Write an enzyme that holds these catalytic residues in place. Structure first.
Site, PDB file in Angstrom:
ATOM      1  N   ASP B  25       0.800  -1.216   0.000  1.00 53.86           N
ATOM      2  CA  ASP B  25       0.000   0.000   0.000  1.00 53.86           C
ATOM      3  C   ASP B  25       0.833   1.266   0.000  1.00 53.86           C
ATOM      4  O   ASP B  25       1.342   1.716   1.024  1.00 53.86           O
ATOM      5  CB  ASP B  25      -0.912  -0.036   1.240  1.00 53.86           C
ATOM      6  CG  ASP B  25      -2.018   0.995   1.165  1.00 53.86           C
ATOM      7  OD1 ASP B  25      -1.761   2.096   0.644  1.00 53.86           O
ATOM      8  OD2 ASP B  25      -3.142   0.699   1.621  1.00 53.86           O
ATOM      9  N   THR B  26       1.008   1.920  -1.141  1.00 56.19           N
ATOM     10  CA  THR B  26       1.880   3.091  -1.158  1.00 56.19           C
ATOM     11  C   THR B  26       1.208   4.323  -0.571  1.00 56.19           C
ATOM     12  O   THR B  26       1.886   5.323  -0.320  1.00 56.19           O
ATOM     13  CB  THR B  26       2.336   3.394  -2.596  1.00 56.19           C
ATOM     14  OG1 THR B  26       1.195   3.552  -3.451  1.00 56.19           O
ATOM     15  CG2 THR B  26       3.148   2.221  -3.125  1.00 56.19           C
ATOM     16  N   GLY B  27      -0.099   4.235  -0.341  1.00 55.39           N
ATOM     17  CA  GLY B  27      -0.864   5.289   0.310  1.00 55.39           C
ATOM     18  C   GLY B  27      -0.729   5.259   1.820  1.00 55.39           C
ATOM     19  O   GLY B  27      -0.890   6.262   2.511  1.00 55.39           O
TER      20      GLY B  27
HETATM   21  N1  LIG Z   1     -11.981   1.552  -2.608  1.00 58.04           N
HETATM   22  C1  LIG Z   1     -11.257   2.333  -1.775  1.00 58.04           C
HETATM   23  C2  LIG Z   1     -11.245   2.024  -0.380  1.00 58.04           C
HETATM   24  C3  LIG Z   1     -10.473   2.818   0.515  1.00 58.04           C
HETATM   25  C4  LIG Z   1      -9.769   3.992   0.074  1.00 58.04           C
HETATM   26  S1  LIG Z   1      -8.918   4.898   1.322  1.00 58.04           S
HETATM   27  O1  LIG Z   1      -9.294   4.323   2.625  1.00 58.04           O
HETATM   28  O2  LIG Z   1      -9.213   6.334   1.152  1.00 58.04           O
HETATM   29  N2  LIG Z   1      -7.259   4.656   1.111  1.00 58.04           N
HETATM   30  C5  LIG Z   1      -6.453   5.831   0.734  1.00 58.04           C
HETATM   31  C6  LIG Z   1      -5.801   6.590   1.888  1.00 58.04           C
HETATM   32  C7  LIG Z   1      -6.430   6.710   3.164  1.00 58.04           C
HETATM   33  C8  LIG Z   1      -5.769   7.429   4.207  1.00 58.04           C
HETATM   34  C9  LIG Z   1      -4.501   8.043   3.990  1.00 58.04           C
HETATM   35  C10 LIG Z   1      -3.866   7.927   2.716  1.00 58.04           C
HETATM   36  C11 LIG Z   1      -4.517   7.191   1.685  1.00 58.04           C
HETATM   37  C12 LIG Z   1      -6.766   3.308   1.555  1.00 58.04           C
HETATM   38  C13 LIG Z   1      -5.836   2.677   0.485  1.00 58.04           C
HETATM   39  N3  LIG Z   1      -4.488   3.229   0.819  1.00 58.04           N
HETATM   40  C14 LIG Z   1      -4.408   3.402   2.295  1.00 58.04           C
HETATM   41  C15 LIG Z   1      -5.852   3.408   2.849  1.00 58.04           C
HETATM   42  N4  LIG Z   1      -6.195   2.266   3.780  1.00 58.04           N
HETATM   43  C16 LIG Z   1      -5.909   0.823   3.520  1.00 58.04           C
HETATM   44  C17 LIG Z   1      -7.028   0.072   2.802  1.00 58.04           C
HETATM   45  C18 LIG Z   1      -8.368   0.512   2.921  1.00 58.04           C
HETATM   46  C19 LIG Z   1      -9.386  -0.216   2.250  1.00 58.04           C
HETATM   47  C20 LIG Z   1      -9.066  -1.354   1.451  1.00 58.04           C
HETATM   48  C21 LIG Z   1      -7.720  -1.793   1.334  1.00 58.04           C
HETATM   49  C22 LIG Z   1      -6.712  -1.073   2.019  1.00 58.04           C
HETATM   50  S2  LIG Z   1      -6.714   2.698   5.370  1.00 58.04           S
HETATM   51  O3  LIG Z   1      -7.128   1.503   6.078  1.00 58.04           O
HETATM   52  O4  LIG Z   1      -7.449   3.951   5.329  1.00 58.04           O
HETATM   53  C23 LIG Z   1      -5.101   3.020   6.065  1.00 58.04           C
HETATM   54  C24 LIG Z   1      -4.674   4.358   6.248  1.00 58.04           C
HETATM   55  C25 LIG Z   1      -3.399   4.639   6.805  1.00 58.04           C
HETATM   56  C26 LIG Z   1      -2.544   3.567   7.157  1.00 58.04           C
HETATM   57  N5  LIG Z   1      -1.329   3.829   7.671  1.00 58.04           N
HETATM   58  C27 LIG Z   1      -2.958   2.232   6.980  1.00 58.04           C
HETATM   59  C28 LIG Z   1      -4.244   1.954   6.445  1.00 58.04           C
HETATM   60  C29 LIG Z   1      -9.790   4.294  -1.314  1.00 58.04           C
HETATM   61  C30 LIG Z   1     -10.504   3.470  -2.243  1.00 58.04           C
END
Ligand SMILES: Nc1ccc(S(=O)(=O)N(Cc2ccccc2)[C@H]2CNC[C@@H]2N(Cc2ccccc2)S(=O)(=O)c2ccc(N)cc2)cc1
Ligand SMILES: [Cl-]
Lengths: 99, 99
Positions: B25-27
């Site tokens: 997860d690069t986010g």
């Molecule tokens: N379909 C879909 C579902 C979820 C999202 S998201 O939650 O916004 N999103 C973007 C994001 C959130 C917060 C900070 C930076 C990026 C996800 C994906 N990248 C990280 C984030 N997440 C992981 C994830 C969530 C749903 C499904 C699979 C993995 S999270 O749980 O918010 C998260 C945030 C910060 C950390 N350390 C770990 C985890 C986007 C599209």
């Protein structure tokens, strides 16, 4: 480009005539951006992660430019705390994970 | 390896001697895993997801193998939607984004 992960991989995008900053996010299945207007039909969707779910509007076949790459895809629009480019559009620019 | 994004970039990790599936997860700035036992003392940490901020447990200098690559770093434990390997350990395994 080869982008390092020492820092958040932030890029500039152009969408709906607008310039926005967004995070290249391999963990996001979908592209999600903060509130904005987009042309065309949309349907409601719920997306979730840590903290819970948010409601968004799903717009399909939207044109986006990401680093000089023109791509077409689905964009979810809603109260997200962070603009992200998800896999649905990272694939279109040929983006891979490498180690 | 070179990993494309047509499907989630799920890999096998080992931690505490156990194999688990985790998402690259690069986010995510930080690695967060599902509730589990880890050695040592932990510290409080807030992390922000799409639905808001939650408290998680922070364990430092933990041994973890990711797709065969050895890492030692901070591992957060909490109600994450899926095990995610965040930038703190993807840097350690030499991971980059490329297009
Ligand atoms: N379909 C879909 C579902 C979820 C999202 S998201 O939650 O916004 N999103 C973007 C994001 C959130 C917060 C900070 C930076 C990026 C996800 C994906 N990248 C990280 C984030 N997440 C992981 C994830 C969530 C749903 C499904 C699979 C993995 S999270 O749980 O918010 C998260 C945030 C910060 C950390 N350390 C770990 C985890 C986007 C599209
Ligand atoms: Cl491909």
């Amino acid at each position: 480009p080869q982008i390092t992960l020492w820092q958040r991989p932030l890029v500039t995008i152009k969408i709906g005539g607008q310039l926005k900053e967004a995070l290249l996010d391999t963990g996001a299945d979908d592209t999600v951006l903060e509130e904005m207007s987009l042309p065309g039909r949309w349907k409601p969707k719920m997306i979730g992660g840590i903290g819970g779910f948010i409601k968004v509007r799903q717009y399909d076949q939207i044109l986006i430019e990401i680093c000089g790459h023109k791509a077409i895809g689905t964009v979810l629009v809603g109260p997200t705390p962070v603009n992200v480019i998800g896999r649905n559009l990272l694939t279109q620019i040929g983006c891979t994970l490498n180690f």
